[PDB]
Write a protein that holds these residues in place. Structure first.
Motif, PDB file in Angstrom:
ATOM      1  N   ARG A   1       0.698  -1.135   0.014  1.00 17.95           N
ATOM      2  CA  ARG A   1       0.102   0.098   0.033  1.00 17.95           C
ATOM      3  C   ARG A   1       0.871   1.147  -0.091  1.00 17.95           C
ATOM      4  N   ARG A   2       0.614   2.307  -1.046  1.00 20.51           N
ATOM      5  CA  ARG A   2       1.258   3.266  -0.922  1.00 20.51           C
ATOM      6  C   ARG A   2       0.400   4.575  -0.845  1.00 20.51           C
ATOM      7  N   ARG A   3       0.833   5.412   0.123  1.00 24.47           N
ATOM      8  CA  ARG A   3       0.068   6.689   0.227  1.00 24.47           C
ATOM      9  C   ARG A   3       0.136   7.630  -0.815  1.00 24.47           C
ATOM     10  N   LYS A   4      -0.353   7.347  -2.052  1.00 21.46           N
ATOM     11  CA  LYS A   4      -0.599   8.145  -3.206  1.00 21.46           C
ATOM     12  C   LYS A   4      -1.677   9.209  -2.932  1.00 21.46           C
ATOM     13  N   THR A   5      -1.130  10.250  -3.925  1.00 24.79           N
ATOM     14  CA  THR A   5      -2.215  11.616  -3.811  1.00 24.79           C
ATOM     15  C   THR A   5      -3.112  11.372  -4.989  1.00 24.79           C
ATOM     16  N   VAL A   6      -4.307  11.766  -5.044  1.00 25.29           N
ATOM     17  CA  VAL A   6      -5.494  11.815  -6.008  1.00 25.29           C
ATOM     18  C   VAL A   6      -6.359  12.875  -5.875  1.00 25.29           C
ATOM     19  N   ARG A   7      -7.351  13.095  -6.578  1.00 25.04           N
ATOM     20  CA  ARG A   7      -8.323  14.172  -6.838  1.00 25.04           C
ATOM     21  C   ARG A   7      -9.647  13.798  -6.622  1.00 25.04           C
ATOM     22  N   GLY A   8     -10.526  14.421  -5.937  1.00 24.32           N
ATOM     23  CA  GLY A   8     -11.718  13.955  -5.838  1.00 24.32           C
ATOM     24  C   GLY A   8     -12.863  13.706  -6.923  1.00 24.32           C
ATOM     25  N   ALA A   9     -13.927  12.945  -7.070  1.00 23.75           N
ATOM     26  CA  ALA A   9     -14.695  12.665  -8.054  1.00 23.75           C
ATOM     27  C   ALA A   9     -15.201  13.929  -8.695  1.00 23.75           C
ATOM     28  N   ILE A  10     -15.555  14.833  -7.927  1.00 25.67           N
ATOM     29  CA  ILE A  10     -16.408  15.889  -8.320  1.00 25.67           C
ATOM     30  C   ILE A  10     -15.555  16.754  -9.606  1.00 25.67           C
TER      31      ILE A  10
END
Lengths: 91, 86, 58, 136, 41, 98
Positions: free
Chosen positions: C41-50
């Motif tokens: 498991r990696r603490r990646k950054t992503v963006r919200g679905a909105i």
RNA sequence: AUUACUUUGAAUAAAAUAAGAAAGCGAAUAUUCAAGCAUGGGACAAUGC
RNA sequence: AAACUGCGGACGGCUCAUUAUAACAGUAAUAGUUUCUUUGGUUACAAGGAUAGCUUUGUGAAUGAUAAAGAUAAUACUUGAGACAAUUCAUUCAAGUGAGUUAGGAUGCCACGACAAUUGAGUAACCAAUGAGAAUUUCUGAUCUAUCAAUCAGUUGGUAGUAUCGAGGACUACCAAGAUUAUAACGGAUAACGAGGAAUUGGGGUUCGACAUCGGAGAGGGAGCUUUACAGAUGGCUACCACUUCUAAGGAAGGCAGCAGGCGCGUAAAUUACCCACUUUCGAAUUGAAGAGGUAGUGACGACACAU
């Protein structure tokens, strides 16, 4: 004590009397790491006689890189970073 | 060790495998199976047979068998002595 | 919406309901990370679905 | 004996077994009403390989006493010995009631019963009175 | 230890460096079982 | 988290042990899931049936001896009949009629 | 009565030590003590009886 | 070929910072636990769906970067039958072992539930061995110090539960006042990893042992975890502390006490070499891989023979 079961005292007696030994004690108490300018090392890189002999001994004062203490050092021969290594007598 | 050992050192190998001390750094590890690592091979070491202690390689017949309830039991053979497992 | 990437290349999530780059201890169960070992498991950054203007393409 | 919050019961409930190499079950074990889960003779605790002895140093602990061992330690250089001692906590079942401080007890090794207790009293021999009749 | 291969010394220098009764007797260069006999005797 | 080794306890004389290593997995402890059914992957791959809560129970023919505070957690020897199984381990409550 | 002591055994990783040009490779190769197990003895000892 | 799936990277290699009855050595137990591999033994003419590589759209500078869509398989994931095995619980009959209400049988209950709906050998559950092994544990054994003399409150024991692969204050609630110490407890120091060993010795001893092999511990410092049969793994992850690096300035990775090699330190220590050919290990396996390993280079550390 001499008896067969008195091995505690003579073992204990010897441990106490060893501390009287000048040569043995010098090699166990903490002075070879704080009072010896050379520490426990062999060499060290750095930067008038007694009554019945007359003349002048040419000498040098040296500040050690590691400790920083200043020591007096002889020059080897006639007409003679510096490496200094003791003398005939140890310490 | 985190897990079971796999490699084997030449020196650590059993004596009777007769491996030299300079042939190679490692020795072949016996796989698990019907015989143990030190009781197999991947007098120079009823009538019985000695497979264990100093008597390994000796044949002969038992005279009597002392038993000690504490630890073990002893077998005497025509005479030398050794435990039962040998 | 079916998904999309942000102006900086990060994909957009589906469960996440925000509009800022959010650092998540991601796993393979939601796409945005492909584990190398198993159970990594990696603490990646992503963006919200909105959706937003930061979505470089939909 | 039911002086605690739980209904104390034996281990094999339907009991007395016997220890192994040349031992005798004490009389108080059978007829005694005591319920002991760690008793060697009336429970499922056994006596394995090791077997020691000594004198009893303390009998204050509940169902436990302290055995003192004295031995010698030969020292190579002086070719002489020195007196030494070691104390081990041994669980003692209520099968022994006359047992008091200063007696000689044969003990056996059992499974870990506490942080320090790992042995069980097997056979005791009383000695002269040390002016204090201190029992379990 | 440092090496599996064995090694040995094949000589031993004398205790006293300068003794005339040895300089003459010894004069390419100047480079066991008695005790073994002793132990069984 | 919870360890079960005796490297943090004292000695019989009261001495404080000194650390020589770090926590090792073979001393694993686990949070006691009080039975007021999950499964836990124990060592060697076997499974432990962790009953979080449960009401039915097989029995064969109001008080906790250990902690009165538990009086409605389900533990062995609890009186409700006296429970004889280990619900937090086996995953079911098996008891006997008093 | 135990213990100590003592005699024999059992059991005892290799390398190394010693041993059957430095080396190398099947020695009975013997260890290797402090403990622990079994055993013949009870003179000198310690512990209670 | 790739990809899915399977196995391994928990072995190997390096280092000695920790650590003073702790670890380690020998001995004893596990009637108090136990897998992985391997070995022996037992116990419906085939069903159902989706998924990568494949193709399509892309994205940001980029990481071992990721997003969309459309297909297709399984020894991947399931259901399903040819018909039991072992867990928990309560009661009972009861032969090995020094020793067991013990292996085992019987009664009723729960739980789990097959021998691939497999492929040109593979698979589940259980029993045994491998296993003297792993892990806990019994006894005996360590350097200096009193300018360290009293120390301990989960502390010592008892009951009952919990937790654990499993014993046990390992932990929780109740009860008791207990445990160690002048035969040196508690505490302090080490330029202390322990042992097999080494140097030197007439006998006796003194000093060294990071470093071939065995055991222990660590991966900049703690800590928390994942996966698995085995890890508190760090050539796996997560957070903090302290640093290192790339950056298009929005972001991004890394852990040489592996092999070479650079600095710093110091009196004090070698090549940024080649190859799996020895020994051995791992793998879906006779092939592949291995800075393990071998070969070559530097190398008055030392040792043996030997020119002038």
């Amino acid at each position: 004590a001499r008896g067969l079961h008195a091995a505690r005292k003579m073992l204990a007696q010897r441990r106490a009397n060893k501390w009287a030994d000048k040569e043995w004690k010098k090699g166990k108490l903490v002075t070879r790491y704080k009072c010896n300018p050379l520490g426990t090392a062999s060499h060290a890189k750095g930067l008038e006689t007694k009554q019945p002999n007359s003349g002048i001994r040419k000498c040098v004062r040296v500040r050690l890189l590691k400790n920083g203490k200043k020591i007096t050092a002889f020059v080897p021969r006639d007409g003679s970073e510096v490496l200094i290594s003791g003398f005939g007598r140890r310490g | 060790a985190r897990g079971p050992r796999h490699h084997l050192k030449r020196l650590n190998a059993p004596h009777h495998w007769m491996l030299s001390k300079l042939g190679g750094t490692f020795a072949p590890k016996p796989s698990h199976g019907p015989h143990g690592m030190k009781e197999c091979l991947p007098t120079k070491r009823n009538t019985a047979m000695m497979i264990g202690g100093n008597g390994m390689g000796r044949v002969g017949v038992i005279v009597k068998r002392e038993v000690h309830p504490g630890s073990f039991e002893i077998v005497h053979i025509k005479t030398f002595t050794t435990r039962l497992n040998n | 919406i079916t998904g999309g990437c942000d102006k900086d290349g990060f994909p957009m999530m589906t469960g996440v309901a925000t509009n800022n780059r959010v650092r998540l201890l991601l796993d393979g169960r939601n796409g945005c990370y492909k584990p190398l070992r198993n159970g990594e498991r990696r603490r990646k950054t992503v963006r919200g679905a909105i959706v937003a203007g930061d979505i470089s393409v939909l | 004996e039911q002086t605690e919050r739980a209904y104390q019961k034996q281990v094999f409930h339907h009991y007395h077994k016997q220890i192994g190499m040349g031992f005798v079950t004490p009389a108080e074990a059978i007829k005694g009403t005591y319920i002991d889960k760690k008793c060697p003779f009336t429970s499922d605790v056994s006596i394995r390989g090791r077997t020691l002895s000594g004198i009893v140093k303390s009998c204050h602990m509940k169902r436990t006493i302290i055995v003192r061992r004295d031995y010698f330690h030969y020292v190579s250089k002086y070719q002489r010995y020195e007196k030494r001692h070691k104390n081990i906590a041994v669980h003692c079942s209520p099968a022994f009631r006359q047992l008091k401080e200063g007696d000689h007890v044969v003990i056996g090794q059992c499974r870990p019963l506490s942080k320090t207790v790992r042995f069980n009293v097997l056979k005791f021999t009383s000695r002269g009175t040390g002016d204090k009749k201190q029992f379990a | 230890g440092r090496c599996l291969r064995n090694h040995s010394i094949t000589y031993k220098t004398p205790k006293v460096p300068y003794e005339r009764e040895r300089f003459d007797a010894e004069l390419k260069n100047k480079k066991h079982m008695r005790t073994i006999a002793k132990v069984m005797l | 988290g919870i360890t079960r080794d005796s490297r943090h306890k004292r000695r019989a004389t009261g001495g404080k042990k000194n650390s020589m290593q770090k926590k090792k997995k073979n001393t694993m402890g686990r949070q006691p899931a009080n039975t007021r059914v999950h499964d836990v992957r124990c060592r060697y791959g076997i499974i432990k049936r962790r009953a979080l809560r449960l009401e039915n129970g097989n029995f064969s023919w109001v008080y906790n001896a250990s902690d009165n505070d538990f009086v409605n957690t389900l533990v062995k020897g609890a009186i409700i009949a006296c429970i004889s199984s280990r619900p937090g381990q086996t995953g079911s409550v098996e008891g006997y009629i008093l």
